[PDB]
Structure 1
Amino acid sequence: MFMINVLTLIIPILLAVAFLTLVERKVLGYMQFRKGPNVVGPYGLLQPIADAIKLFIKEPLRPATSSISMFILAPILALTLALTMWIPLPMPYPLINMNLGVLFMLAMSSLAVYSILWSGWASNSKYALIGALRAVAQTISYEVTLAIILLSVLLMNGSFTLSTLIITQEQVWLIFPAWPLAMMWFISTLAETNRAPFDLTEGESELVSGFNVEYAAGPFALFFMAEYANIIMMNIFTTTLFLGAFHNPYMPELYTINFTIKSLLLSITFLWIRASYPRFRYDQLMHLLWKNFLPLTLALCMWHVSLPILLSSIPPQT
């Protein structure tokens, strides 16, 4: 019975990833004064099916100079970590109701970097090494500020449980008292997933393709669905953190519709940002978070740890 629950969790997110490829292509085309795919089917509904069937009947092309074991393990680890880290999200009831879901998602987001790193190192190429080291630089740029942002915004919730975050935002949204943390969190989620303007790993300008330049079709699709499932999970995580919707225990479909449309708007905002900005340099991103975001994050952390004591508004931990 739990098998039914986990398969009904993991199949619609793959379908969502494919239709996210469709929506990304069509919306990005329409923002560039042109049209997206509409010839494959009725309004292009069959383009992701054609892409998926095409990519799984092509040659795998395992290189000779690459360590084959890590070359196979890295996309498997990427897709796996993209799968078993959707679980603690309350929709409105999570599949796994972890007591420490926030730290779990932090740890498994730290673990997903190793797939990119071992993909870059395993395939014996210089561009893959450059992409892997740029991923390392991006991780050391963003991780500490991301964790302090989460700690400062969880001081009003009471605990690390993601299920109690709806109860915290039952009266008002959490973006009203923590909007600078919300903006910094949005930039951190943009830089976490290597999305534009902080791509810097699959750079088609400075490099050819980066870490996945030696990965032909079949294994290359795994990184694509891992990245797109990652951006959907960041959108849902940001929606739960800062845009908590009204929850009725008798009608969970209201909360499901509400956070579904909010996460869709957040993904639309992601693609809106993608089409409009030039790519950051990966040394400028390093000085962005470590010099501008970090002092403000420390000041806001001290403000948010001295605020509930000041106002007799310390939230319960139960």
Structure 2
Amino acid sequence: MFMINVLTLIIPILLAVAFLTLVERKVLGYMQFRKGPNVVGPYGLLQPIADAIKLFIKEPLRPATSSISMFILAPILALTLALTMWIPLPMPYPLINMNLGVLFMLAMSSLAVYSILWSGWASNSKYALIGALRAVAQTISYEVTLAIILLSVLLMNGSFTLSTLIITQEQVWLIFPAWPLAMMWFISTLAETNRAPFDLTEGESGFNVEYAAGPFALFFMAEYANIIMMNIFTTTLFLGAFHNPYMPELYTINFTIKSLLLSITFLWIRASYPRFRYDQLMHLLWKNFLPLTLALCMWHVSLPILLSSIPPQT
């Protein structure tokens, strides 16, 4: 019975990631005064199916690798970490209800940079290794503000429990007392997933240009399996929905609608701006987000003490 719960978690994750490609192409199409796919399925609904089948029957490279084993371990770690991020997400009840789900997700998302690093190792191209090192330094830069913003908010939560965060926002959204944290958090999750304006894997050649259609479709989909997750995590963190314990699907419809609107907000951001130069987003993290994030972390340390609003431990 628990295995049925695991499968109804992880198979709809891959289906939602598949149709997120269609939603991306359609929404980017209409924002660009054109259409997205509408030929392959009715309203393009068979486009991700045809695309996944097309990739799975292309010839892989199997190049001269510095490591064959890490060439294999990069998609496996990517998909495994991209699927295990979803297991403490309370919607309204989680698969694994753990006391430290927030810190769990922070640690497992910190583990995701090894996919980028091993994919840069496995290609013998030294320029792909350079781009992988730039991607890793980008991701570990924005993990700092992820950790500190998340700590500042959990100072208003009371615990590391993700299901407590629904109880925290029963009166007000947590974007109202923490919108500067929310906007730096949202841009930092945008910079975590190598997503535009923070993507540096299409132009000055990325870390996963060595992969062609066997592992690539897996990498990509693991990457989008992070993106929805991060928005769902943002939905739990700043836009907490109403939970009726006798009708849990009210919460499930409400957080699903908010997470869809936030993933579409990612799509609507990448269709609206140019990219950063690499040192410009390093300037954005280390000189603009990090002083504000430290200042607001001091503010959210001292603020529940000065208002007598320290949240419950349990």
Measured in 2, the distance between the counterparts of 1:253 and 1:145 equals 33
How many Å apart are 1:305 and its aligned residue? 1.0
Q: Is the 8 A contact 1:191 1:198 kept in 2?
A: yes
Deviations 1:45-84 (A, max 9, x none): 1101100111111112210244211111111110111011
1:288 counterpart residue number? 284
Q: Is the 8 A contact 2:103 2:160 kept in 1?
A: yes
How many Å apart are 1:200 and its aligned residue? 1.5
Measured in 2, the distance between the counterparts of 1:297 and 1:224 equals 31
Unaligned segments of structure 1, at least 5 residues? none
Q: Is the 8 A contact 2:78 2:222 kept in 1?
A: yes
Q: Does 1:273 pair with 2:269?
A: yes
Measured in 2, the distance between the counterparts of 1:80 and 1:116 equals 14
Deviates more, 1:61-70 or 1:248-257: 61-70
Q: Is the 8 A contact 1:134 1:201 kept in 2?
A: no
Deviations 1:130-188 (A, max 9, x none): 22111122023212121111111111110110010000000111011111000000011
Query: Following superposition, which runs of at least 4 residues in structure 1 exceed 6 angstroms of deviation?
Result: none
Deviations 1:186-239 (A, max 9, x none): 01100011100001134477xxxx111111111010111011111100000000
2:294 counterpart residue number? 298
Q: Is the 8 A contact 2:98 2:161 kept in 1?
A: yes
1:222 counterpart residue number? 218
Deviations 1:16-54 (A, max 9, x none): 001000010111011111111111121111101100111
Deviations 1:226-257 (A, max 9, x none): 11111100000000000001100000010000
Measured in 1, the distance between the counterparts of 2:97 and 2:269 equals 33
Q: Is the 8 A contact 1:141 1:285 kept in 2?
A: no
SS in 2 for 1:93: coil
Deviates more, 1:132-141 or 1:242-251: 132-141
Measured in 1, the distance between the counterparts of 2:313 and 2:242 equals 21
Q: Is the 8 A contact 1:170 1:246 kept in 2?
A: yes
Q: Is the 8 A contact 2:120 2:132 kept in 1?
A: yes
Q: Is the 8 A contact 1:202 1:211 kept in 2?
A: no
SS in 1 for 2:157: coil
CA gap of 1:12–1:311, structure 2 versus 1, over 3 A, is same
Measured in 2, the distance between the counterparts of 1:141 and 1:23 equals 29
Measured in 1, the distance between the counterparts of 2:65 and 2:9 equals 38
Measured in 2, the distance between the counterparts of 1:201 and 1:182 equals 26
Measured in 2, the distance between the counterparts of 1:139 and 1:37 equals 32
Q: Is the 8 A contact 2:29 2:35 kept in 1?
A: yes
Measured in 1, the distance between the counterparts of 2:202 and 2:128 equals 9
Measured in 1, the distance between the counterparts of 2:170 and 2:292 equals 28
SS in 2 for 1:154: helix
Count of equivalent residues: 314
Unaligned segments of structure 2, at least 5 residues? none
How many Å apart are 1:106 and its aligned residue? 0.7
Q: Is the 8 A contact 2:116 2:207 kept in 1?
A: yes
How many Å apart are 1:101 and its aligned residue? 0.7
1:29 counterpart residue number? 29
Q: Is the 8 A contact 1:131 1:202 kept in 2?
A: no
Measured in 2, the distance between the counterparts of 1:221 and 1:83 equals 15
SS in 1 for 2:189: helix
How many Å apart are 1:123 and its aligned residue? 0.9
Q: Is the 8 A contact 2:116 2:136 kept in 1?
A: no
Measured in 2, the distance between the counterparts of 1:273 and 1:65 equals 36
How many Å apart are 1:113 and its aligned residue? 0.8
Deviations 1:272-291 (A, max 9, x none): 00011111111111111111
Q: Is the 8 A contact 1:26 1:36 kept in 2?
A: yes
How many Å apart are 1:127 and its aligned residue? 3.0
Measured in 1, the distance between the counterparts of 2:66 and 2:202 equals 19
Q: Is the 8 A contact 2:17 2:225 kept in 1?
A: yes
Deviates more, 1:279-288 or 1:269-278: 279-288
How many Å apart are 1:299 and its aligned residue? 1.1
